[model samples]
Target: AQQARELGQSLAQEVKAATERLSLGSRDVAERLRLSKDIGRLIEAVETSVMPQWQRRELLATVKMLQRRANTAIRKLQMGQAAKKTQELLERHSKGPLIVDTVSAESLSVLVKVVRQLCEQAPSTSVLLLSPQPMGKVLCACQVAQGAMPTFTAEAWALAVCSHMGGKAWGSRVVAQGTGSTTDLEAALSIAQTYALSQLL
Candidate 1:
């Protein structure tokens, strides 16, 4: 029983790592499709293969979630040229005449745009992208939302923004948060973009 439980835990980690590797783009579409299938089979086996009830539940949950996320990513993979455009948009402001302090609504909007771009390409990534742990690639600005809570939700941030701004009285008010770490700011902006898209979708 102990051995089975350990094995189930190990497979959960594998599914997560494989998903990340696929995200990093080491494999092409067909290879990725195969990998996804293999992982799905592993997840199913984890259900009744050789694990305790607790371990099986954990492994089952992780792989099931990963399977859905992978499916979302694969669909986006077929999006073709739009994915390329998202990369450009992410780097568009990277050349940097760089801001020193305080993130303005305008600058924040740019951050949000990058997040938006990613979600537009892959909506399932909204939860994954906003996730602080898997999101070392994003800015501290994006990380800021995670720091404030367990998981940053588009619904929550939207309410925060709306409440802070007094319900869309228009251009008269602002959230006016500060910016730190230029690279993080860029990532954070993208995170905001992701949040925005989450609300829309």
Candidate 2:
């Protein structure tokens, strides 16, 4: 009988350790929820077959506290996932912040996705370093539309967002390749900078 008591106590300690271990490395809500359910069964066992009522009561209390923590962890993941989905789903139709005019819609789409992936991978980056306010305003209207923050100082980017000057009621802008080295993007940004500063004065 004494040996059985010792074994039960050891089992209880193992259960607590398992709960903490699962809590620490829980990858996602689904995995954590499964772990929480497994812990639930362990709690149930102690609740039913234990000797003194206080042992069951205390173990029940501790497990219940851990269960609540698991619940809180899952809730936090759900909230964050929801917010990220909202950001990714911003453009019902792409018309914001940076105006990307390209012959290949697929290329632009891929570029935007690549930029987002870069932002996710490198949190500390300026993917869309731009000029002016109304110009910045273009980027301000959209979230993920900002080009990949400069991975290079002035080496240009994988994709470019050149500018345009209107003619009559219609004009076309060049969204060319490589960097500002050859493309008119530098000239456009410089013009925008002067336009913005002039207005500010």
Candidate 3:
């Protein structure tokens, strides 16, 4: 994202410079004309490049409640303050079409980071990509309703992350929250809601 944008900005400036040069003719900037014309070609070659984005939101009250009460899955590693960043868990709300613009880049990073921190901080946390029934039950996120606690697991976390990140890579990985998810992200406003609350003090 940064690269394309930087290149595009450069292209824009070059074009502007080139146009301005028309006034000065032999003076002004000599290379601007050449650069502006070539920039579009460079952009076209990789115009499909897209970034991942994270959609943040409050976690299920059920999950938080579960942690507070039974420590059921409470042993799960959460590095940040889970409550404050209520919307951090809404990672699936990021994606787009062929044009990978500035919309959903960070979504993948958010999920990957959560899983990674959990694996790193508390390896004992039981995590998985799918439940025993797999498709039998609805996703924890899907079932998560207002004021309800969520049954968070490595599996659900990873899946949620991948869905939001939106790409072919989501299927090929083990832990969806691993660095692979963030290779090229594009998450947007979702972060304003969920993830980091559990990661902090």
Candidate 4:
């Protein structure tokens, strides 16, 4: 029990320091990525140790909380960078729904936020954000602007794309998100883009 307490204390200190660094808003993507990875490692270390269950649970909770905060910070950083490119893309494709294929987000939550940001920029233009993830899977988000809602809801857009990509999704009239498994991300994205264009036409 004594050794377990010491281990937990040391792990908590490391997580606290990492959380501070993440909150400092360092723009270095690589550094932020490393910090997240380190936190995961710390959590794993605690889980695998032969410590008392109560001690392990307490320590895990502390580390996980810090990890979540760090992840949010990273997601926000990535979202800001991705939003700039998305805005430019929307400018070029001002005629119809915007399909952003090149932008990569940290997670589905970030993709949703980016979709909302784009909607704010063009309240009438529907937006679809897609990115490839690990294990040949793809994450996607759709947002139907106020002007577009009359024609197509965000849920409909997400369902159509997920059907074509062999995935499942759910959403409301304003926003929807899903994930699909596909080896060809480009092809999946192209299919999604085509579907969005068809809706506008």
Candidate RMSDs in Å, in order, are 15.6, 16.8, 22.4, 5.3
Candidate 1 C-alpha lDDT tens digits along 30-64: 66677778877887677568867776776677677
Q: Which of the two candidates, 3 or 4, achieves a greater lDDT against the reference?
A: 4
Global lDDT of model 4: 0.75
Q: Over the stretch 42-92, how does candidate 4's per-residue lDDT look in tens digits?
A: 888888876678767887887788788778878877788767756766676
lDDT of model 4 at position 184: 72
Q: What's each prediction's TM-score?
A: 0.37, 0.42, 0.21, 0.61
Candidate 4: C-alpha RMSD to true structure equals: 5.3
lDDT string for model 2 (1-201, tens) is 576577678867886787777558487667877867877887777766646667767777777888788877766665555445434543342433232222111122233343444345444332332222222222110112124332222212222232342211111121212212223445545553343333222
Global lDDT of model 2: 0.44
Candidate 3 C-alpha lDDT tens digits along 76-181 = 2222323212234224323111111122122333233443443343333322221111222211111111122334333344344445544122322233322223
Candidate order by decreasing lDDT: 4, 1, 2, 3
Residue 37, candidate 1: C-alpha displacement in angstroms: 0.8
| Displacement of the residue 117 alpha carbon in candidate 4, Å | 1.4
Cα lDDT computed for each candidate against the true fold? 0.46, 0.44, 0.30, 0.75
Q: Model 4: clashing residue pairs?
A: none
- Report model 4's TM-score to 2 decimal places: 0.61
List the candidate 1 regions with Cα displacement exceeding 4 Å.
81-201
Better of 1 and 3 by lDDT: 1
Candidate 3 regions exceeding 4 Å error are 1-42, 45-106, 128-201
From the highest TM-score down, the ranking of the candidates is 4, 2, 1, 3
